[PDB]
Amino acid sequence: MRPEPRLITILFSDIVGFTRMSNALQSQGVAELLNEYLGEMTRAVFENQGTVDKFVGDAIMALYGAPEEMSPSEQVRRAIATARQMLVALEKLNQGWQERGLVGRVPPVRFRCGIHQGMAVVGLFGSQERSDFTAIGPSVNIAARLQEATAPNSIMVSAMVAQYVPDEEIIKREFLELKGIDEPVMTCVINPNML
């Protein structure tokens, strides 16, 4: 539990289209959609042994390599799997909310995922009033920024991550001058399916 510098893999995944689609539905329905979603995303993380740090609205933050130790390679492999697995759950969901009037009648829901790996102080943070497990540092910023920057329905990763990823699975490369970062960063959109 106690905060410490460790090498971990952060995964952020947010959606775009929620608000507007539930725009119709009495909060009640809205809650039904969000939980459904969250229920899914969570499944993709736990099945791939990751840790669900937190939920920031419709955003999911997940860790790999903390609290439980995990090899930097297993970290990138499981962070990737979740991302692709999550992409499959939405399709499965968007398919159901479509056929149901919660979508299509309000564009279907879009997905944005960004993953990064690097050092980050990992521990319990907060105080007596409230204290949660989470990572903190420039590396967390990075992953997050990577996720806000990638195209809709895509997965973007840092070079640190891509080095574990087969070459032909990397769709597109590009340096991004991420806020607060001096050194522009090399980003990689990875194929959303595999090999």
Ligand X SMILES: Nc1ncnc2c1ncn2[C@@H]1O[C@H](COP(=O)(O)CP(=O)(O)OP(=O)(O)O)[C@@H](O)[C@H]1O
Tokens 């809650």 belong to 31
Residue 167 annotated as binding?
A: no
142 binds a copy of itself (CB under 8 A): no
User: Which CB, 33 or 70, lies closer to Eu ion?
Assistant: 33
Q: Which two tokens stand for residue 32?
A: 């039904």
Q: Name residues contacting a copy of itself, limited to 31-60 (CB under 8 A).
A: 31, 34-36, 38-39, 42-43, 45-46, 52, 54-57
Residue 165 near which of a copy of itself, ligand X, Eu ion, none (CB within 5-8 Å, type-dependent): none
Compute the residue count for the chain: 195
Residue 182 annotated as binding?
A: no
Q: What is the distance between the alpha carbons of residues 60 and 13, in angstroms, rounded to a whole number?
A: 5
125 binds a copy of itself (CB under 8 A): yes
Say which amino acid occupies 167: D
Q: Could you count the other beta carbons within 10 Å of the beta carbon of residue 104?
A: 13
DSSP state of 29: H
How many residues bind a copy of itself, per CB under 8 A? 41
User: Which CB, 123 or 164, lies closer to a copy of itself?
Assistant: 123
